[PDB]
Write an enzyme that holds these catalytic residues in place. Structure first.
Site, PDB file in Angstrom:
ATOM      1  N   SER A 164       8.685  41.200 -22.204  1.00 17.26           N
ATOM      2  CA  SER A 164       7.900  40.109 -22.826  1.00 17.26           C
ATOM      3  C   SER A 164       8.504  38.745 -22.459  1.00 17.26           C
ATOM      4  O   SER A 164       9.639  38.682 -21.932  1.00 17.26           O
ATOM      5  CB  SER A 164       7.764  40.317 -24.341  1.00 17.26           C
ATOM      6  OG  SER A 164       8.981  40.104 -25.025  1.00 17.26           O
ATOM      7  N   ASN A 218       5.979  34.868 -28.561  1.00 12.36           N
ATOM      8  CA  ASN A 218       6.317  36.075 -27.779  1.00 12.36           C
ATOM      9  C   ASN A 218       5.003  36.725 -27.340  1.00 12.36           C
ATOM     10  O   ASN A 218       4.123  37.009 -28.221  1.00 12.36           O
ATOM     11  CB  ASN A 218       7.220  36.984 -28.619  1.00 12.36           C
ATOM     12  CG  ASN A 218       7.894  38.098 -27.854  1.00 12.36           C
ATOM     13  OD1 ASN A 218       7.348  38.615 -26.898  1.00 12.36           O
ATOM     14  ND2 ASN A 218       9.063  38.524 -28.311  1.00 12.36           N
ATOM     15  N   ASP A 247      12.976  43.191 -23.162  1.00 14.27           N
ATOM     16  CA  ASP A 247      11.863  44.178 -23.224  1.00 14.27           C
ATOM     17  C   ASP A 247      10.784  43.839 -22.182  1.00 14.27           C
ATOM     18  O   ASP A 247       9.861  44.660 -22.035  1.00 14.27           O
ATOM     19  CB  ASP A 247      11.328  44.282 -24.657  1.00 14.27           C
ATOM     20  CG  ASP A 247      10.453  43.128 -25.128  1.00 14.27           C
ATOM     21  OD1 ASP A 247      10.381  42.103 -24.442  1.00 14.27           O
ATOM     22  OD2 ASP A 247       9.836  43.278 -26.179  1.00 14.27           O
ATOM     23  N   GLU A 286      14.623  26.451 -30.447  1.00 10.25           N
ATOM     24  CA  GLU A 286      13.830  27.427 -29.632  1.00 10.25           C
ATOM     25  C   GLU A 286      13.585  26.870 -28.221  1.00 10.25           C
ATOM     26  O   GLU A 286      13.823  27.601 -27.255  1.00 10.25           O
ATOM     27  CB  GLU A 286      12.503  27.770 -30.314  1.00 10.25           C
ATOM     28  CG  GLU A 286      12.673  28.606 -31.563  1.00 10.25           C
ATOM     29  CD  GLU A 286      13.101  30.038 -31.267  1.00 10.25           C
ATOM     30  OE1 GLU A 286      13.209  30.368 -30.065  1.00 10.25           O
ATOM     31  OE2 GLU A 286      13.306  30.824 -32.213  1.00 10.25           O
ATOM     32  N   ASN A 329      12.334  37.999 -22.054  1.00 10.70           N
ATOM     33  CA  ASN A 329      13.067  38.885 -22.995  1.00 10.70           C
ATOM     34  C   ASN A 329      13.496  40.178 -22.285  1.00 10.70           C
ATOM     35  O   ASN A 329      12.852  40.549 -21.290  1.00 10.70           O
ATOM     36  CB  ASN A 329      12.213  39.248 -24.209  1.00 10.70           C
ATOM     37  CG  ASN A 329      11.767  38.037 -25.000  1.00 10.70           C
ATOM     38  OD1 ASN A 329      12.557  37.140 -25.274  1.00 10.70           O
ATOM     39  ND2 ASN A 329      10.509  38.030 -25.407  1.00 10.70           N
ATOM     40  N   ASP A 375       8.749  34.468 -23.974  1.00  7.74           N
ATOM     41  CA  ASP A 375       8.546  33.449 -25.028  1.00  7.74           C
ATOM     42  C   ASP A 375       8.048  32.148 -24.380  1.00  7.74           C
ATOM     43  O   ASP A 375       8.615  31.703 -23.364  1.00  7.74           O
ATOM     44  CB  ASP A 375       9.818  33.288 -25.856  1.00  7.74           C
ATOM     45  CG  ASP A 375      10.470  34.611 -26.206  1.00  7.74           C
ATOM     46  OD1 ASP A 375       9.827  35.418 -26.886  1.00  7.74           O
ATOM     47  OD2 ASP A 375      11.632  34.823 -25.776  1.00  7.74           O
ATOM     48  N   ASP A 430       2.393  36.364 -41.540  1.00  6.86           N
ATOM     49  CA  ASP A 430       2.269  37.779 -41.069  1.00  6.86           C
ATOM     50  C   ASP A 430       3.167  38.738 -41.879  1.00  6.86           C
ATOM     51  O   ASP A 430       3.238  39.949 -41.521  1.00  6.86           O
ATOM     52  CB  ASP A 430       2.585  37.853 -39.566  1.00  6.86           C
ATOM     53  CG  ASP A 430       2.498  39.232 -38.911  1.00  6.86           C
ATOM     54  OD1 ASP A 430       1.407  39.854 -38.957  1.00  6.86           O
ATOM     55  OD2 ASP A 430       3.529  39.675 -38.341  1.00  6.86           O
TER      56      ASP A 430
END
Ligand code: NDG
Ligand code: CL
Ligand code: CL
Ligand code: CL
Ligand code: CL
Ligand code: CL
Ligand code: NA
EC number: 3.2.1.17
Length: 129
Positions: free
Chosen positions: A50, A59, A48, A35, A46, A52, A101
């Site tokens: 967003s 995110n 979209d 990562e 990202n 990281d 989650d």
């Protein structure tokens, strides 16, 4: 801060990640390597819009506030800047919420693609834990 492998295995262990929800330490170390390259200062935008953040590339869509991801959640209740600290506490606490989650470690694309079903113990081999 860029962690050494064993340095990050130990920190992650101190912070309660070893076998957290049944994910052995090597799973976390492997996910960090692919990562962030173990770099707590890693940020990546990202498609979209967003971002990281940090050693586990958490995110801004769901987990943290960066004030520039319109209509996003802040479910770990932190500024995304908190996840770029040389102290991994904030990242680790948020990670515990993420892996709890529903989807487990599949929330980490690099983990699903590069660590899942591999010999992840090889990532902690020879570390003083
Ligand atoms: C736990 C978490 O927030 N994971 C993010 C994921 O949402 C994002 O799609 C990916 C991009 O490569 O980086 C991280 O894996
Ligand atoms: Cl390494
Ligand atoms: Cl926002
Ligand atoms: Cl730390
Ligand atoms: Cl799971
Ligand atoms: Cl392991
Ligand atoms: Na957000």
């Amino acid at each position: 801060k860029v962690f050494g492998r064993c340095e990050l295995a130990a920190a992650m262990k101190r912070h309660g990640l070893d076998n957290y929800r049944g994910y052995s330490l090597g799973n976390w170390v492997c996910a960090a390597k692919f990562e962030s390259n173990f770099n707590t200062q890693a940020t990546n935008r990202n498609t979209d819009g967003s971002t990281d953040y940090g050693i586990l590339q958490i995110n801004s869509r769901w987990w943290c506030n960066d004030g520039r991801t319109p209509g996003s959640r802040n479910l770990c209740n932190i500024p995304c800047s908190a996840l770029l600290s040389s102290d991994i506490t904030a990242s680790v606490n948020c990670a515990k919420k993420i892996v709890s989650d529903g989807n487990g470690m599949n929330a980490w694309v690099a983990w699903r693609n590069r660590c899942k079903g591999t010999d992840v113990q090889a990532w902690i081999r020879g570390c003083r834990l």
